[PDB]
Symmetry: D2
Subunit: 115 residues, 4 copies
């Protein structure tokens, strides 16, 4: 698993299930190229986004649709989405876990990077 | 003001107002002695807990009554309180700001220490 | 002051000083137009980005240059920047405070919205 | 796994390995009774703290020795320890995951509670 995203709900104390996200990779003209996509499972996790061979050096953006998640719970949130922008694989392959902890007016994100 | 506490509400996007907290200092017999207490203002801040003369070296604990805060909003939260335990003034007097960001199943705390 | 940003450093226990950030507003053609920019003060705060007249309804993005901040401290951080994307003034003028807490592999952001 | 604790390092982007913690349960005289103990594995996780039969209604405190963790990295941290105090099993058994994200001057904690 070169890239996995885990999403937690800080209000309900649960995984954040069915959270949609897209992953983009910055192109040479500084535009965002589509790269991967999916939605979180019942464990709050999204696996299988990419393969080691396809996941090369670049600047990547994970755009998580947190607004739709809160709206489904009848809560008006602050953010349009949560974005996580990072350089990956600049020293060769690594495995990346992106974790996001969600509240209506706040989010916290961290990365675990393993060789 | 050598010690100030600021509390924010991540559900409502507001200062956390009227939040009670108690400060303790570890005594020579290793018990927690009462040191100061108060409630946050309309800005989510609690000033005036102590003075430079009274705020000697020691181990201090701030216990923020997050449970009563959430219960008054009709929410059953996870934590009994949010606690911050730290050594203060080890190397001479410092000014401490403790900030806490609250959600029903999560809290995040940080300190700003200035000379 | 309808928009203020405060940045804290979780490694050093200090305001994050001299942190650059750029604010964008989504244009009618869905592109990000420059709106305002500045750097945090010695208190970690950036005031004066905009005015009530200029800060109309819209989707805004604050991009905080966390990478340059960590690199100047000799740290190679994970994120390219910390981003906050939000709809503002949907239901009339509001005052927004965005707070960001920074670590090399993590950031946490919250908003306080007042009428 | 009725009770699991997961600890992450926000500075290095890694699990926090070999982090010691003790779990206490509040007794009738309001003192803290020893309940469980251990240290995190190479994945940053501590499993096997208790069994369903032993883990009954009570107020529990997880005291995580974050200070020793930072000192091993030559970093002087703010907190003496990170504490997580919560009522558990008041509506019968649940499974609890306590997550803590550590920085030298900050920690963030959340709970995942599953029936
Ligand atoms: C403390 O647990 C909470 C659960 C919830 C659950 C809200 C919710 C809304 C719609 C649903 O379909 C399910 C849960 C909200 C809370 O603060 C707003 C706290
Ligand atoms: C809104 O003004 C403030 C925000 C904050 C935000 C603190 C904070 C704590 C934990 C987090 O995860 C994010 C922000 C701190 C302050 O100390 C003076 C003032
Ligand atoms: C960006 O990754 C970092 C790694 C580290 C690693 C520190 C360290 C110290 C002692 C050790 O034995 C291993 C790592 C520190 C950082 O900011 C202080 C950032
Ligand atoms: C419950 O299992 C996990 C919890 C967490 C908690 C992450 C987190 C992120 C931000 C915070 O402010 C607090 C915890 C992370 C994980 O990484 C795979 C797994
Ligand atoms: Na001393
Ligand atoms: Na409107």
């Amino acid at each position: 698993c070169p890239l996995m995203v885990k999403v937690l709900d800080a209000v309900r104390g649960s995984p954040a299930i069915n959270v949609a996200m897209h992953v983009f990779r910055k192109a040479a003209d500084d535009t965002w190229e589509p790269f991967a996509s999916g939605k979180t499972s019942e464990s709050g996790e999204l696996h299988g986004l990419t393969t080691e061979e396809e996941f090369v050096e670049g600047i990547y953006k994970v755009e998580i649709d947190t607004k739709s998640y809160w709206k489904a719970l009848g809560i008006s949130p602050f953010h349009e989405h949560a974005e996580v922008v990072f350089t990956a694989n600049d020293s060769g392959p690594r495995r990346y876990t992106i974790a996001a902890l969600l509240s209506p007016y706040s989010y916290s994100t961290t990365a675990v990077v393993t060789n």
